[PDB]
Nucleic acid binder design. Structure first.
Lengths: 229, 427
DNA sequence: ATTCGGCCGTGTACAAT
RNA sequence: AUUGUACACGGCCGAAU
């Protein structure tokens, strides 16, 4: 043992140099897709390189801060049928309606939501991060309500019903209400599996196709070495 | 492909008269407390504590009083004492205050008042009054009825003995391998506004002691008060010690995030320059600004044997500003480990620093040894808050003071009221 | 201005010795 | 408010140019 799976899924392969068309900043720059504003420029990486045809190496300063949004925009393409991306930007919002025969499902609908992030360190390695956040939604209305907000409405005993179900789907508590042992392990088996069946790749890795090269994600948590120094 | 490092096993609790109390073991800590008294036994002029409530001949309150007697007489060693009951008979705050005036006139040094309901305005409005004068502990009857009173009153009385001016426990953190004067910070957001406080640490006795606290400061005056506090901490350290700032003068910021320049770090650098121009701090002074955050998209699978949760000390990153740190390991009960929900670790980021990259790696852990050493320091219950005492305590101070001022209660401040220092009142 | 990272409040529950 | 740990909402505060 002696490893701390750090919620990061490595980018095992990506282009050594990414064609980035640097453009002086313009005031009407939308957040857009395939465009990053670091410093006081606009970098039309990937789709939209018809202007400069430029290339940016691995060690360049702009590469680390451009390839992050490059990777987010290329991961915002291949998603499976059930999931639906909600918002894109600093992170990617991957949601999926839950259908697991949880008690009193006909009154309140639960919704897995995936927080796609990405972290770079040492300037030569990468990896994507995932975080989950179930959304409480009344199935007949589809609005955001809290356990206290239901109270006697929607059923007083149903507070014990969604909450237990919420912590069960979230893998924090048992499907009955008590607490179990392997909560931590299931907290991330769920994340790995959800990403795997979210990006439409039941296989271990998905080889996304970029305008520059091929991006491959191990889809497995980033092992941390037990180096003491 | 990061690498994590663990603090060497230690940090045994010290409770005076010598100790060997481990950590993350509430049963062992309370066994030690029963066998060995607290660090500084808070005996006062009036060896008499009152319990003020509304119930009459209720068996639950009687069991509460019996447990209080049998524990504070045997586990917290505030001897020669008895518990007196006072009845207000009207949940209105004026009647309760009139009743506690009887206890004040009697002179009892401890009031373990029991509220009837979950009533925030009256609770805080009366906690201001009954905390700026006497050590006390406001509690409520609704939640008292439900759960077991053993595990309830144990933490109740830990917080009580802490509030009595004494110290329940102290940690085995060396005078070396630490920061001489840590000026921590926390915040509490009310109406989308940050209110800040500083838990100044002075190393009063060679061991990291939360020596004195500071009131709430709006972010507009945050930098000016930080400069004033940098000056005040070295003033107090010189007054209480003839030593010099040889190791560090770091900070601990949470609820915000300091700047790389033209901000918190510039204020710290300039004020340390002023201090060293008057021989107050050594030339080899280390600024070492910091930033602490609790919520973040990160999680950790610890080793499977330890309930898949990271151990009591971890530093996962390297050569980057950000670092992660785990503090709440599952509690080691008699059968094994406490079953726990997934926990979110604390992320440490050195926003700015001036170790000049010679022994940078050594001093990153030198700070990060301290925070894990400085997080179990807090005295609010048998359970830590996974933030340093220099982060927990300012957060609690800001919350209490902001709640008090929101309801227009009796004003509290730890600057005007000199007696509030080295006497936890904000818990 | 954007990218990117958090961040603390009020109410459900769970459990320690 | 015995404490924490979590949780869901509501509102979001600020790092880097």
């Amino acid at each position: 043992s002696g490893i701390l799976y750090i919620n990061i899924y490595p980018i095992v392969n990506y282009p050594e140099t990414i064609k980035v068309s640097a453009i002086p900043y313009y005031e009407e720059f939308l957040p857009g897709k395939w465009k990053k504003r670091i410093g006081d420029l606009i970098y039309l990486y990937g789709y939209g390189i018809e202007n400069e045809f430029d290339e940016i190496d691995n060690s360049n300063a702009l590469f680390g801060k451009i390839f992050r949004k490059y990777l987010l925009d290329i991961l915002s393409e291949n998603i499976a049928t059930p999931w639906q991306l909600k918002e894109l930007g600093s992170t990617l919002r991957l949601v999926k309606e839950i259908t697991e025969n949880y008690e009193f499902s006909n009154i309140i609908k639960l919704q897995y939501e995936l927080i796609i992030n990405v972290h770079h360190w040492q300037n030569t390695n990468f990896g994507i991060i995932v975080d989950l956040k179930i959304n409480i939604l009344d199935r007949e209305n589809n609005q955001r309500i809290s356990y206290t907000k239901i109270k006697d409405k929607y059923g007083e005993s149903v507070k014990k019903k969604i909450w237990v179900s919420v912590q069960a789907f979230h893998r924090h508590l048992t499907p009955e209400g008590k607490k179990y042992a392997t909560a931590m392990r299931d907290k991330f088996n769920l994340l790995t599996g959800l990403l795997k069946e979210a990006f439409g790749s039941s296989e271990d890795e998905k080889t996304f196709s970029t305008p520059d090269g091929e991006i491959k994600i191990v889809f497995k948590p980033l092992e941390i070495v037990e180096v003491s120094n | 492909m990061m690498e994590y490092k663990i603090v060497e096993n230690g940090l045994t609790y010290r409770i005076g008269n010598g100790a060997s109390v481990p950590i993350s073991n509430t049963g062992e800590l309370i066994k030690g407390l029963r066998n060995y008294g607290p660090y500084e036994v808070p005996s006062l002029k009036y060896n008499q504590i009152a319990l003020i409530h509304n119930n009459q001949f209720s068996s639950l309150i009687n069991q509460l009083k019996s447990q209080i007697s049998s524990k504070i007489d045997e586990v917290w060693h505030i001897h020669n004492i008895n518990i007196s009951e006072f009845i207000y008979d009207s949940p209105h705050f004026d009647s309760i205050k009139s009743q506690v005036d009887n206890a004040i006139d009697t002179g009892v040094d401890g009031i373990m008042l029991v509220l009837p309901e979950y009533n925030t305005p009256l609770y805080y409005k009366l906690k201001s009054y009954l905390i700026n004068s006497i050590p006390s502990q406001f509690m409520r009857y609704d939640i008292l009825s439900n759960r077991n009173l053993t595990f309830y009153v144990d933490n109740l009385l830990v917080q009580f003995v802490s509030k009595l001016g004494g110290k329940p426990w102290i940690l085995n953190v060396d005078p070396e391998k630490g920061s001489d004067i840590i000026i921590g910070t926390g915040a509490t957001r009310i109406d989308n506004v940050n209110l800040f406080c500083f838990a100044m640490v002075f190393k009063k006795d060679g061991t990291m002691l939360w020596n004195e606290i500071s009131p709430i400061v709006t972010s507009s005056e945050y930098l000016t008060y930080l400069k004033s506090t940098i000056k005040k901490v070295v003033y107090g350290f010189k007054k209480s010690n003839p030593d010099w700032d040889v190791e560090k003068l770091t900070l601990h910021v949470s609820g915000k995030r300091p700047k790389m320049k033209d901000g918190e770090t510039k204020i710290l650098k300039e004020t340390v320059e002023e201090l060293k121009k008057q021989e107050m701090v050594s030339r080899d002074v280390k600024y070492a600004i910091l930033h602490l955050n609790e919520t973040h998209p990160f999680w950790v699978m610890g080793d499977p044997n330890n309930r898949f949760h990271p151990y009591e000390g971890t530093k996962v990153k390297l050569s980057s500003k950000r670092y992660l740190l785990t503090l709440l390991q599952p509690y080691l009960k008699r059968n094994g480990l406490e079953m726990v929900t997934p926990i979110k670790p604390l992320s440490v980021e050195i926003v700015s620093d001036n170790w000049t990259s010679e022994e940078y790696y050594h001093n990153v852990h030198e700070i990060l040894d301290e925070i894990y050493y400085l997080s179990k320091m807090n005295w609010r219950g048998f359970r830590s808050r996974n933030l340093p005492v220099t982060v927990n305590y300012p957060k609690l101070v800001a919350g209490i003071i902001a709640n008090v001022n929101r309801y227009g209660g009796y004003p509290i401040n730890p600057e005007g009221n000199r007696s509030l220092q080295t006497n936890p009142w904000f818990l």
